[PDB]
Design a protein around this nucleic acid. Structure first.
Lengths: 77, 111, 75, 149, 87, 70, 82, 87, 73, 92
RNA sequence: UGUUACAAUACCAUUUUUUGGCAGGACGGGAAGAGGAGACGUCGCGACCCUCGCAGGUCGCUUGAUGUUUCUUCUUCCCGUUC
């Protein structure tokens, strides 16, 4: 019963580690902690770690503003 | 040649004039259309095709021989590109108070 | 913008297919004018034959530019 | 003889209604509109059909009831999947011995009411050199029949 | 009855593809003028059909002509239809 | 294009498929509606008849005019 | 308004076919059409681009993944001839 | 200002439009839309070099160089239109 | 709660990295200016092709249409 | 005063290199989405980065069954949709 | 006074238009011999079948057509085009 802009911000208050999927690029995923966003879902993320989908490694990228037009699917852990 | 068949078509409602001229259109087209004409809209078309100065003048003259008001505009334009021409136009096809006035205003300007 | 009427699909187990030929089942919590769909009970259906239970109660959300379509599993 | 004024002024969707205008030889088929699927040259005084180059659009070439004596072998139209030639002045096989190089998308070919049609050994010789067509003179063709050619 | 634009078609051979049967009743009746509309149903109007010609008089030729010709294995009948074909 | 109403339009979509149909109407987004539309993929070969279809202006690459009306 | 969207709004209660931009075709009964070309589709029979055919109860495809819909042919008589 | 209005100066101008699928259009603009949708005339389009999808589109038209009397192109598909060198 | 326009205008004059949407190309440089619509302007741009450097380029502009993300190094 | 807030954010925003290349008449190199690197001068800038160029020297890459060759052409006048634009890079 | 047409004025953020994009000799067809094949569907040529009237389902194909998806040519004759 929650519209999605009120369901982004509960990642932000509770500060959950969040897995985010890209858009028409299935080999790589990004995982991190949501630190900021906007009305067009352009997301600034903390502790950003790449996930090669094809053992899942990581390259620590830390602070990333991920532009929302490649954002697909927002989860957590 | 393509002109033999065309000729046959011609000689045997402006469809032969269209098929000969508009298919070619350039020189060939000119040859055709003009010929057809000699054998208002048609005149206009011919003029367009032509579009040298002398030729244009000739065309205008031809048109004048036998939308008079409409033509008069054309005459005026020709003159611009005069007074004599305007006079000629007036004498053949005597609506033309505002055009006459305009013409005069050139004289006035000159003065 | 008109509201996309998915009120029939509220609290319903739906099946979102996603660009890159991804398929994600879940239960709808919310939507918006951009059709950004919130799913309770996230179930990632991957390729061969696992079924990745992704977010069981943590109400995932999918951006509307990546949603291909949706099948309500129930009526 | 087939004025290009005549060729334009009968098109409807089911073709070119060009039927009862009795002409002699095609000179201006240059003037076809180009989305033509049917050429309706029936009830015409045709003795031949020349002047059809690579017009890959016609499906049904009507030539029925035409004083026609000859069907030819390099006369193009590439997708004639229907073709009538009935009710004409054709009278001998080797008039139409040039139906070998008719294209391979040829399926309906009618020759009823002609002088060629009443000959014995009929369906063998026309399925000969036209081996793949479907219906012949409003008659379906089986493949067991096609072992004749 | 009347004698109008729509020539009544009957007793066709039912073993034919209906899209093949419209075409083969187009190319057959194209010798008697332009065939404008052939309406036809396999929803139990099967065996019978409607063919509407352009000219009134061109329908009068083929009905005298083709009433009794074999066509895919059956000698068909051609009549004048009771009512002018709609649409 | 309002000039081009009620003509047959050979309209080329994004994936190389070509539609041929009578233009019923268009709009701001070039959303087209096509009476007795036919769909062909590989280019006469490989054609499918659709009928009265819509065509969204997102997918059109170009549209050209096929033929005159009745 | 948009005449195609106005056309699609009259197509409610009718059986359509929806081919999608990945290629799959959705034949079903159009009951609810949205102004942004979003369509709720009942009793849908669905066909993959490779040819896998399934039937589904309810499908709802977004606007910007639709190639084209095919409305039934009764609509082209009125009120969109003007 | 708005360079969409810059293209509205290009009426009857003999340009070469290049499209996103590699289609090279060569012809004269009659008009252009405020969403850059370009109608053209007396235009033959080439699909330069390669000969290696789009190509199907060129063959879709009476078109590899195919010329069509009237062509309307969606403005979102244009990559770049080359204008006459005398301008 | 660093919102993106507060995030990025504060990130001006920092050697930031930008990955494109193609992943064939990245750019490392100092972000000079950024509008509301997230066009980027980088100075002393080094091009990173597939994660390895392509070369030094200079004052560069990146369209909004290709910015996959942007990172601070 | 709508336009002044539009044009001064235009002035020292990310549209500076498209505004500076034209004023100083210095060629900027433009790499497009299909790898058509375009080095050219700028005549005008738009909101969408629509660009009208002069003395365009488009360079692209053609791949075959041996060493890749370089294909380049000179275009005197060019109008360019901003959609293909990835990178505007000014060379000194 | 009304109707129609074309321009001016009023307008890059996910569903539309400001891109998720890119990477004698040649040719064709048919047949024979020696070292293209299997799936999923989608429309056709025959019928022992079904069905019976005015408002296409099933089975063969005895070498019917056609899109995904995996794997790995030479000789001889006949018919057309070109020099």
């Amino acid at each position: 019963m929650v519209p999605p802009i009120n369901c982004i911000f509960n990642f932000l208050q509770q500060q959950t580690p969040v897995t985010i999927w890209l858009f028409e690029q299935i080999g790589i995923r990004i995982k991190g902690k949501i630190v900021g966003f906007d009305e067009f879902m352009n997301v600034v993320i903390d502790e950003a770690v790449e996930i090669p989908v094809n053992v899942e490694k990581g390259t620590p990228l830390g602070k990333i503003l991920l532009k929302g037009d490649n954002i697909t699917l927002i989860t957590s852990a | 040649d393509e002109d033999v068949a065309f000729e046959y078509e011609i000689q045997k409602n402006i469809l032969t004039w269209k098929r000969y001229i508009e298919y070619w259109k350039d020189k060939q087209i000119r040859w055709l259309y003009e010929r057809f004409c000699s054998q208002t809209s048609i005149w206009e078309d011919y003029i367009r095709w032509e579009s040298e100065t002398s030729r244009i003048f000739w065309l205008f003259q031809r048109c004048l021989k036998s939308d008079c008001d409409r033509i008069c505009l054309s005459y005026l334009e020709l003159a611009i590109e005069i007074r004599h021409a305007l006079a000629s136009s007036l004498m053949k096809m005597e609506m033309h108070r505002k055009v006459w006035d305009p013409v005069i205003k050139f004289v006035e300007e000159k003065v | 913008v008109s509201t996309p009427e998915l009120k029939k699909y509220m609290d319903k187990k739906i099946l979102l297919n996603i660009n890159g030929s991804r398929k994600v089942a879940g239960i709808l919590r919310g939507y918006d004018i951009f059709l950004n769909v919130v799913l309770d009970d996230a179930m990632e259906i991957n390729g061969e034959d696992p079924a990745n239970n992704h977010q069981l109660g943590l109400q995932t959300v999918i951006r509307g530019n990546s949603i291909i379509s949706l099948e309500a599993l129930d009526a | 003889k087939f004025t290009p004024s005549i060729v334009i002024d009968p098109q409807y969707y089911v073709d070119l209604q060009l039927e009862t205008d009795s002409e002699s030889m095609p000179s201006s088929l240059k003037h076809l509109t180009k989305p033509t699927h049917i050429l309706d040259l029936t009830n015409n005084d045709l003795i031949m059909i020349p002047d059809l180059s690579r017009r890959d659009d016609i499906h049904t070439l009507l030539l029925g009831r035409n004083n026609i004596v000859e069907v030819d072998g390099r006369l193009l139209p590439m997708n004639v999947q229907n073709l009538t030639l009935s009710n004409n002045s054709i009278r001998r096989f080797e008039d139409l011995q040039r139906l070998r190089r008719a294209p391979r998308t040829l399926k309906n070919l009618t020759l009823i009411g002609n002088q060629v049609c009443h000959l014995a050994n009929y369906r063998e010789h026309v399925l000969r050199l036209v081996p793949h067509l479907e219906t012949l003179d409003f008659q379906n063709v089986t493949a067991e029949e096609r072992k004749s050619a | 009855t009347e004698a109008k634009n729509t020539l009544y078609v009957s007793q066709l051979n039912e073993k034919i593809n209906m899209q093949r049967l419209r075409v083969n009743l187009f190319l057959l009746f194209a010798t008697f003028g332009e065939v404008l509309k052939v309406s036809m149903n396999f929803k139990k109007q099967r065996g019978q059909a409607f063919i509407t010609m352009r000219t009134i008089d061109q329908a009068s030729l083929a009905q005298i002509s083709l009433n009794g010709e074999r066509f895919f294995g059956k000698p068909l009948k051609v009549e004048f239809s009771k009512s002018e074909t709609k649409t | 294009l309002a000039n081009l109403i009620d003509y047959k339009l050979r309209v080329l979509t994004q994936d190389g498929r070509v539609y041929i149909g009578q233009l019923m109407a268009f709009d701001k987004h070039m959303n087209l509606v096509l009476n007795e539309c036919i769909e062909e993929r590989v280019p006469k070969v490989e054609k499918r008849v659709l009928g009265l279809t819509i065509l969204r202006g997102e997918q059109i690459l170009s549209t050209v005019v096929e033929d005159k009306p009745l | 308004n948009g005449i195609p969207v106005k056309l699609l709004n009259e197509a409610q209660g009718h059986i359509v076919s929806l081919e999608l931009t990945t290629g799959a075709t959705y034949r079903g009964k159009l009951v609810e059409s949205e102004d942004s070309m979003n369509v709720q589709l009942r009793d849908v029979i669905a066909t993959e681009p490779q040819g896998a055919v399934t039937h589904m109860d309810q499908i709802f495809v977004r606007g910007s993944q639709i190639k084209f819909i095919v409305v039934p042919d009764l609509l082209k008589n009125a009120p969109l001839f003007k | 200002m708005k360079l969409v209005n810059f293209l509205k100066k290009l009426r009857n101008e003999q340009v070469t439009i290049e499209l996103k699928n590699g289609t090279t259009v060569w012809g004269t603009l009659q008009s252009v839309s405020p969403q850059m949708n370009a109608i053209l005339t007396d235009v033959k389009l080439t699909l330069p070099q390669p000969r290696l999808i789009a190509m199907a589109s060129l063959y879709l038209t009476g078109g590899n160089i195919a010329s069509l009397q009237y062509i309307n192109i969606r403005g979102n598909t244009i990559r770049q239109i080359i204008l006459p060198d005398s301008l | 709660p660093v919102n993106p326009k507060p995030f990025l205008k504060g990130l001006v004059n920092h050697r930031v990295g930008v990955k494109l949407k193609f992943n064939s190309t990245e750019y490392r440089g100092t972000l000079v200016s950024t509008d509301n619509y997230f066009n980027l302007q980088l100075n002393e741009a080094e091009e990173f092709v597939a994660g390895v450097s392509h070369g030094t380029l200079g004052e560069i502009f990146i369209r909004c249409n290709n910015v996959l993300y942007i990172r601070e190094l | 005063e709508l336009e002044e807030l539009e044009e001064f954010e235009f002035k020292h925003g990310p549209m500076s290199l498209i505004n500076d290349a034209m004023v100083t008449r210095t060629p900027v190199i433009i790499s497009l989405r299909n790898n058509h690197k375009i080095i050219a001068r700028v005549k005008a800038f738009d909101r969408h980065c629509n660009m009208v160029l002069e003395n365009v020297k488009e360079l692209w890459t053609e791949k075959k069954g041996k060493n890749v060759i370089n294909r380049e052409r000179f275009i005197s006048k060019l109008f360019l949709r901003g959609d293909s634009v990835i990178v505007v890079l000014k060379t000194p």
